[model samples]
Target chain A: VTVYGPMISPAVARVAACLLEKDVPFQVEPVDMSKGEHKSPSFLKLQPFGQVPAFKDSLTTVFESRAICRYICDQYADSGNKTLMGRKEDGVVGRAAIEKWIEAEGQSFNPPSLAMAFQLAFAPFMGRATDMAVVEQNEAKLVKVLDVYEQWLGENQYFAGDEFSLADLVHMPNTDLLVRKTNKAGLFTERKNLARWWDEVSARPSWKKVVELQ
Target chain B: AAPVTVYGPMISPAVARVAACLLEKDVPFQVEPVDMSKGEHKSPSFLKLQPFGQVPAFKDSLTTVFESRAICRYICDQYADSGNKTLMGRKEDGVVGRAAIEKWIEAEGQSFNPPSLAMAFQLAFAPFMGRATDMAVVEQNEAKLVKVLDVYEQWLGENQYFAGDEFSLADLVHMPNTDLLVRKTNKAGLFTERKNLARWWDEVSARPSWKKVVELQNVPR
Candidate 1:
């Protein structure tokens, strides 16, 4: 299998990290955003939106980071660490909870988290000054989100339930910056369950590999 | 026993959508309306079920599910062996169909929902919120919606449905919001102008499930 996108992209990191979690071997073919390679005709053919982390395997060519992640989990559902998608035994209810958290990650979590990451990490990394006002705005919103996470994590060990799943993995890239590079680690460190949950997910071998790729 | 109970007012498009998917699956559910006017949605009890205090939380025996789209996807998965199995593009249907269904579903969430919701707020909900309709906001979002529909026109021109020939949740999920735009705003022309998009809308909106949603939306709050 081959994945195309610059490793710097959080979206790309998500797909790569998922593959590592499943122990699926794949290659990353770089599509450099800095040089506008992503918008080139050849790249747009793979991802219509010109976003990163497009995937190609013997079966199909897929785009969208979350979509690519879902495809990998479903295709390799029977492979290493089936728990990542959660067990099917508890039936629809179990599966329902999984989908619910994934949606929350999309609808509720990703927006504010992405905004925070861009302002704090990417802006400064690109030689632009970090806008403290933008940071404060996103930080305030993220704190509200993490407050909910603190409540949810208190009940269950992981985001989707008792087991580790893609829901937790999806937040790693952005949360990594918040907890590591930025002053925002306080967001996680301040809350007990939130801190504990972050500690566990960030310790994973797959997530470790993702950080190394950066 | 009914497999689910949903909490939130019926007039909510979010609530109506979850009910629509349940109806599509022939799954029985009970609705316990959460009155937003009284700030019931933000009550501690409600927040326990839905951490964000958002409407359309689902309870099926022991498990509770929140987030409207997630609840819809859950109904499809839970009832995959029952009514309207193909709404999710079953695994037996092959990867291409499954991938297509998912791609459009993602498009609906990541692309279509935001702009449509913006238009809905300005044209429909804003008046009730004690604010006048902002034509500028409506126009801005309408332009975005047009760009989205342009892509939809191209894709729907190629296939009978957003995912394929069959009407899936990808199409079903679109009904609640678009139906509101057609009923409440002159912007209905957006759909009428696009040949493929108009036809697709007519087909999905005409479904008994969505007809039920329309009926639920009409009930006096």
Candidate 2:
């Protein structure tokens, strides 16, 4: 299997981390956005949206980082982390809770964190002025989401009952960016439960490998 | 899994999405309305079901699930053997098939949703709320929607459905927004202008399950 995108992209890192967890051997075929290669006809065929992290395997191709991660988990179910997608033994309700949180991260957490990452990390990395107004608004949104996470994490060991699942894995890349690459680490560290949850997931060998790949 | 209930008004697209999923799956469910117009959505009881004060809080027997997409998935999984078994393709069956369906669903959520939601609120909901239509916002979202539809036109031209030959959830998720734009805004031209897109819409909108939802949306549930 191969994932097409620069390693620095959070979306790309997300797919990479999932592969590492699933023990799926994959190649990174970079598409340089600066050269407008992503918009080229060839690349557009792989991903009609002209976005990166387009994935290809022997069977088929797909895009959307979250969708790619799910594909990795589904295709390699019996491999490394079989339960990363949620253990089949957990049945209907357990899987539902796990999926609900995964959808929440995609719907709620991704928006504000993406905004903050662009402002606090990417903008500076690209030598652009930081948008304080964008950071301020996104910070407020992140606070509300983190507050909910803090209380929820206090009871459950992980987002989906007691086991680590895709719900937790999907959050690692963006949170890693905000906490490590910017001063906004305080948004997470200040909340003990959210901080503890982050500390646990960020220390995973798969996540650590993703960091090294960057 | 014998009984299921969705709590929200029919006018809500999210609620409607859940209803359509159940109907497609042949699952029997009830709609217990929470009048968000009356601020009942934020009440303690509704929060217990949804937690975020959002529409389309769902319950399946003793278990409750919120988030419309999440609710649809749970319904699809728990009753996978019961309803439209093809709503989600299993990995053992065809990994690519499921992945393809998924990416298009993501496409709907991403590219199609942002602009369409903005347009619907401006052109449809605002006037219903006694606020005059915001033509500026409508124009802005319409421009964005046109670009997205242009892409969709190319996509549907090649395939019979969003994912491929079969009418999966990829096609089903699109029914609500397209119905709203034409029914409320009378902008059939938004879809009809594109040859392939218009053909795709006609087939998906003609589904018995979705047509049932259109009826539910009009009657007070």
Candidate 3:
């Protein structure tokens, strides 16, 4: 399998980690966005919009990163790892719960975290001056999302429940970015259970590898 | 086999979602278009079937379902045998699988689709009418798009499918909305930078079912 995209994308990092964690053999063909490599015809054929991390099997190709990841997990994982997809036995209700939390993470948390992270990380690099006003605007949203996450994490070890499923991994990029963006990381402290959960997860080798990369 | 009828406008992604669900399941059915352009969605007859006058009402055998997602679920529940395996997860796994499906669906409808829709209106419909772009709205939505993709980055890191290892209804539901932004942006870097999400995108867009459904909409406007 071949997955193509820039090196910096959190989404790409998440998929790469999954492949590694699951021990799936794959090739990483960097479609360097800085070089406008993604827009090439060869890349676009795999992903019409030329987005990364597009993947190709011997016969199939797909885009839409979430779908692609889900497809990979579905196709490759053992019964236990399938928990990330929420496809293991809990039945229909299991499906709904999985959807609920995933949506919550996306709708409730990611918007603010990513907006703030991007504003902090990239806007300045783009020849567009960083507007602290825009950064502050995004920060408020970030704080609100963190509050909710803190509440959830306090109650559960992982996002989905007792298990560390895909739900937990879904927030990895944002949380990893937070650690890089701040020294205190005190925002997670207000929620004791959440902080504890974080302490446990932050120590994982997979997570360490994700954050250790410059 | 007895027939099933779905009343909806093909243009609405929600309606299209349910239609795709039916097709994926290979359930024999007919689409009764609820033409929003003709003011038919609000007509009294339509409203009688769906009090809100929402297009994409479903009528199967004796049961009638109103909400688009609910109606789509009914299609699967009644004809459980058909569909991508992700609909309910593994047979032995049970409720956990179903809940996961619902969670992803909510993510699709409430999170991913809305911001993408805002972009659609601004880029597709508004410009056609010579409307000025609302920069604040655009920025907010752009932020949302980034955030949602980031979350997907995390999830894709672990799963093969949205609900699990199965392609199920949850993944199917998200396709059109994601595609909406994808086609409109036409290769913008909004997603490529996020590696996990970028990888997931390639796989989702490759589904034969998704490709077939998308091609049906390619007629020139």
Query: Which candidate comes out best when scored by lDDT?
Result: 2
Chain A TM-score values, per prediction: 0.95, 0.97, 0.85
Using TM-score, rank the candidates from best to worst.
Answer: 2, 1, 3
Give the CAPRI class of candidate 1: medium
Q: Is candidate 1 or candidate 2 better by TM-score?
A: 2
Error of 2 at A63 (Å): 1.0
Clashes of each: 0, 0, 73
Error of 2 at B33 (Å): 0.6
Give candidate 3's root-mean-square deviation (CA, Å). Answer: 11.6
Better of 1 and 3 by DockQ: 1
Q: Write the per-residue lDDT of candidate 1 for residues B1-221, one digit (tens) a residue.
A: 65579998777778888998898888888888788889898999998788898898788866778999888877787677777878888666676667767776787788788889899988888887789988997888888888888878877888889777788888877777788788877788888778998888888888898888777777666
- lDDT per residue for candidate 1 within A36-85, as digits (tens), equals 99888887677766777778899888777778888888888877778787
Better of 2 and 3 by TM-score: 2
Please tell me what DockQ candidate 2 reaches: 0.66
lDDT score for candidate 1 against the true structure: 0.82
Q: Which candidate wins on TM-score?
A: 2
Of all true interface contacts, what fraction is found in model 2?
Answer: 0.66
* Residue B99 miss distance in model 2 (angstroms): 1.0
Each model's lDDT comes to 0.82, 0.86, 0.66
Query: What are the per-residue Cα lDDT tens digits for candidate 3 across B110-218?
Result: 5677787787677655765679867688778988777777667667778877765667777787777667666765534666566766666678778776776677566
Task: Give candidate 3's error at residue A75 in angstroms.
Answer: 0.3
